[PDB]
């Protein structure tokens, strides 16, 4: 089945709030500024705004490759 529009919008807001809190705690050291979620039926893209992107990316892109993993593990939507 499906849920109503009210529940859908409240769920989207709660997901954005939790994502912002997790990203804040994780990337405070890197000057994390904000998060922007653009939902597309193909993929859901997440843009991270921070002062320096070198620390967020990590070496060879390791750290960001970690983050996109745990997010997928946390909220459960498919790989």
């Amino acid at each position: 089945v499906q849920i109503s529009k009210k529940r859908k919008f409240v769920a989207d807001g709660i997901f954005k709030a939790e994502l912002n809190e997790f990203l804040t705690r994780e990337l405070a050291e890197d000057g994390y500024s904000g998060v922007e979620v653009r939902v597309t039926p193909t993929r859901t893209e997440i843009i991270i705004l921070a002062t320096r992107t070198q620390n967020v990316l990590g070496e060879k892109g390791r750290r960001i490759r970690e983050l996109t993993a745990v997010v997928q593990k946390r909220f459960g939507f498919p790989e």
Binding site: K6, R7, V10, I14, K16, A17, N20
Partner: protein, 55 residues
Amino acid sequence: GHQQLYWSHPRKFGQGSRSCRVCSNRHGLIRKYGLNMCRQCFRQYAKDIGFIKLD
């Protein structure tokens, strides 16, 4: 044995079956629209969720 007794009390309804999704507190809980937050956490995260004060 202990395996049977531990956590045996049913928790399918009541205040003991519900808690805040942010701080795990069971008092002052908001269940409308499936928010499942206590009032303080909701007041902290309302702008992020999308509730605006117009009046």
